[PDB]
Every structure is written in C-alpha cells, then in structure tokens.
Structure 1
Amino acid sequence: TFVDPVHEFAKELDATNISIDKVVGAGEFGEVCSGRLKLPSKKEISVAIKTLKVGYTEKQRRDFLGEASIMGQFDHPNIIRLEGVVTKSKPVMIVTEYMENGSLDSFLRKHDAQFTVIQLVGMLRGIASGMKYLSDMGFVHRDLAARNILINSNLVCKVSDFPIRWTSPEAIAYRKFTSASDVWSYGIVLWEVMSYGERPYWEMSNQDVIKAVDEGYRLPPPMDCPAALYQLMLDCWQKDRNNRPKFEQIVSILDKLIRNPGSLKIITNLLLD
C-alpha cells in the first residue's frame, strides 16, 4: 500500500559518489542533468539528476522532495527507480534511473512509423504493468500521459512524474479520481503510442474536448491501428468507469497479443461511439 506523505522511502546519498556528465536544461524546481552514481558495492551506473534551485523557498523544497517520498515507495521494473536524495548538502538533489531515450511522446515523434507493431505493444505492456503495480498500491497517478513515460536504450517504458486531454469525464466533472480514471488515461496513452506521439484531441478548445467526450465522441483509430488495440482504447474510454478494464486485464490483453502476433494483422475528426 502507498502512503500519502522523505528519509522513510529515500536513501541519503553521499555526494562523493555522484558525478555530473551533462546538463540537460531547466526543470520546475531547478536544473536537470545526467551523470554517474557509484553504488556501495562500487558498481557505477548512469543516473538522471535534478537539483533544487539556489534560494529555494521551504514550500519549493517540500514539493521537490515530495516527488522522492512518493517515487521511493515503488520498486518495479516499469516505474522509474529512485536511487536516492542528497539533502545534507546543497544543492539538494533527486537521483533517479537514467533513461537514454527520454520522454516517450517526443521519442515517438522522431520515429514516426518506424517501429513494428510488436515493438509498440511491448512499450504499452510495460506501461500497463507499471500501472497495475501503482493501482495495486492504491496510488492514483492522475497525470498518466506519454510525456510522463520515459523510455530507455532497450525501449523499456517506465512511469514517471510523481490535464483535460488525459483526464476521464468523471474526474473533469467532479474530481472523481480512481484507478479507473487512470485506465481512461492509459487509453489515451495507447492512442498516443499508436499515433507516434500525436497530441490527443490535437488543439481543440478545451471546452470542446470536454463536451465532445461527454457526447460519446472518441479519438479516431490511428493509421494502420490493429482492431484489437482500437477496441482496447474504446474499452478504456467507457463512459461508465465500472465497465473499463482493470490494469491486470489490460496487461493480460496485451500479453495475448504478444503471444499471438497474427491477431494484430486485423486492422480497424472524432468518431461517435
């Protein structure tokens, strides 16, 4: 079980063991970079590093480290791993799993139509597995989107980041956030992946995204989308949250498609469903 919140769930790292190799850019609370971490066993691994800006407010420190207090509760191959934090020296740091290929949406946009359907299904299965664990822990993510999934050198996708286009109708209507609203979001991620990082609902007015979805309109099948995967999207997007599949069912559906890849050969403006 997830507990709503830092040293209970995060290792305090010795800064001597951290080296910075590359500055990536600015983040919400400070800089973002990558480098190397020397583990207690002397093994050296690549890591993502983010720092808290100099002259931070106490609120900024709390919100920054709050990420680590959440992330550190999870240990799963499809959830970004927290290596630890540095708080006893400044700048304050959060050190996480290095993901060579960055955010999934931007990665797929660079590779439009360049992966096999089985490669894409593997990415999607990883995301679903991570979400099955999060939901098993009672954690509702509320921001599940391809931009919040990171992808490593071997194309393994992992949930990271601990709005309207990704949010279920009931969560928009009255803030009813449940694991079933995360399943809705997963359906949107599924569309994002099969579309190679197209923006869900493009740049439709937010009011129109809300109204169209409420009226029963759904995102159309991506080009060359397997029927099985478009149906899975529609199932994730059921108006009645009780009729959406559970994450365990989504994982099982994708596993069957991986086991029977011939199934993917059956191929399927908003569409009224």
Structure 2
Amino acid sequence: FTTEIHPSCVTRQKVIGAGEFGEVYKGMLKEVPVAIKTLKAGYTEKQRVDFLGEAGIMGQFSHHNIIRLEGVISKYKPMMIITEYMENGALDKFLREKDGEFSVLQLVGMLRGIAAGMKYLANMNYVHRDLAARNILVNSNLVCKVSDFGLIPIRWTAPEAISYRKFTSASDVWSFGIVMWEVMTYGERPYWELSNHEVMKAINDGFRLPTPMDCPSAIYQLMMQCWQQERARRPKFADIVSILDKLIRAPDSLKTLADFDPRVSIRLP
C-alpha cells in the first residue's frame, strides 16, 4: 500500500536528529538526497503501530505544502521512513539565520504555503497538534512543507487544547497565528522570556502578542483573529488561504503597515 524501498537503495550518511526509538539521518536514495527515520531493534508494539501508522498517513498525503514520503522499509530491520530532503532545514532556524534577508512578499508567500498545507490536512481530517515553525521545512524554492518531528509547546497551543485537551483544526488555526508571528519576526520566541504559566495567564487576561516590526496591517489583523478565545470565532483554514492569496495577488495591499509599539525611546535632535 505504501511504497516499499529495498534497503540496498538507501545509504545513510549523517545523523541529523533523533526519533521516538531510532535516529534521523540524511542520506541518498537510488541518487536523490533523502531524510531517513529509523525504528531500532527493541521497539515496542505501540512504537511499531505509531511508526507504520505515521508512514501510512504520510503516504496518503499528496500536496505541494506537505512533506513528501518517498517510501518505507517495513520488510527488513531497522524499519525506515524516507522523505524528500529539504536543504534549508527547519523554518525557525532558517529565519533566525537569515534575519532581514527577505521581502514582505516572500514572507507572506511562505505563510500562504503553510496555510494551504494546513487546509489540506484539516480537510483530510488530520489534526496536527504541534504546528510551529520548528515543524516546517524549507526547500531551495522557498516552499514551506508542513512536517512533524515529534516533541510541551504551551506557547503555540490554543487555550482549549491546553485546558481540556481539545485538539482540532481550530486549535491548529491558533497555532498558525503563532507561526505567522514567527515568520514576520524572523523566528523570535513567542512571548519572549515569559514562563509557560505567565503566557497562559496573559492569554486568559486578554493580552495578545504585539505587532512585529514591518508587518502589513492585514497580516496582523489575520493573526489576531486566529487568537480568538472562542474557538468558533476563528477563521477556518479555507478563509486564511483565501485572504493570503488575495493579498499576494494584489501586493500593494501589503504596503499598509500596522503600527509598531516601540519598547525603547531614543531621542535625538
């Protein structure tokens, strides 16, 4: 059902991270570069179910803005999940290393792509639960692909998911709003140094993240509506994609900027 790759076609080269019960590698597939997640000897029944379940769901997704599965090794050990390789890595680190290097139109384009991937997931009845810039990969065309590397992300999570574990595509919309703020700030840490409890207290008291610098008014308005306490009031991903698409296609719309609240005053004559 899911494309099975023979192990002789896979060459693991470099460790790039860790999995639930295995490592993640960069490698080559027979040669196309790939990323490879392994499940190592001793894995439990639950871990096998979760691993092959992940491969199965990934193999069903076919969208420009969702990481693409090349295939799986399930008939030999170690088992492996093999995806396309994204040369620019994770979005959060990418933007922190490229501060100021992109145009507003490029940044908004990345958000449209993320939103289109999320619309697809939500429509497929897949709730992500961990949407954050650390879980988005960037290719050499600046295309953002929603992914999930595994883990608690209080600062990205909607109030109802924190409070009573209600994870839905509307809590993913909240998280998307946070991602919008991450992108427009080049990977600033949401809420800066506030502790997790201080973040939750602030949200419940009605505070929201302030405008990024150089942020189109329309983009700030959209992120703010993703952060409505009442789940039913938030936009759906279809609404988000539509808005972002219309802003990009009429790019003068992005020239009107929201006011940035200075945290520091410098007086010169």
TM-score, length-normalised on structure 1?
Answer: 0.88
For residue 141 of structure 1, what is the aligned residue in structure 2?
128
Runs (4+) of structure 1 exceeding 4 A deviation are none
Cα deviation, 1:62-116, whole Å, max 9, x if unaligned, reads: 3333321221221111111111111211221110121111110011000111111
Take 1:96 and 1:203, find their aligned partners in 2: how far apart are those partners?
A: 35
1:115 counterpart letter in structure 2: F
- From 37, 41, 46, the counterpart of 1:50: 37
1:104 counterpart letter in structure 2: L
Equivalent residue runs for 1:100-179 within 5 Å: 100-161=87-148, 163-179=153-169
1:19 to 2:16 alignment:
no
Contact 1:29 1:64 in 2 (8 A): no
1:258, CA displacement in angstroms?
0.9
1:145 counterpart letter in structure 2: A
Contact 2:59 2:69 in 1 (8 A): yes
For residue 248 of structure 1, what is the aligned residue in structure 2?
238
Take 2:92 and 2:78, find their aligned partners in 1: how far apart are those partners?
A: 30
Take 2:229 and 2:238, find their aligned partners in 1: how far apart are those partners?
A: 20
Q: How many pairs are equivalent?
A: 256
Equivalent residue runs for 1:182-193 within 5 Å: 182-193=172-183
For residue 64 of structure 2, what is the aligned residue in structure 1?
77
1:29, CA displacement in angstroms?
2.3
Cα deviation, 1:174-218, whole Å, max 9, x if unaligned, reads: 122221111111000000100111111123121111111111110
1:22, CA displacement in angstroms?
3.2
Query: What 5-or-longer segments of structure 1 have no aligned partner?
Result: 1-7, 39-43
1:32 counterpart letter in structure 2: V
1:145, CA displacement in angstroms?
0.6
- From 3, 28, 33, the counterpart of 2:25: 33
Take 2:190 and 2:21, find their aligned partners in 1: how far apart are those partners?
A: 27
Contact 2:40 2:77 in 1 (8 A): no
Cα deviation, 1:148-184, whole Å, max 9, x if unaligned, reads: 1111111100110172111111111212222111111
Contact 1:50 1:93 in 2 (8 A): yes
Q: Identity rate of aligned residues, in percent?
A: 72
Take 1:159 and 1:46, find their aligned partners in 2: how far apart are those partners?
A: 19
Q: CA RMSD in A?
A: 1.7
Take 1:71 and 1:199, find their aligned partners in 2: how far apart are those partners?
A: 29
Take 1:202 and 1:61, find their aligned partners in 2: how far apart are those partners?
A: 38
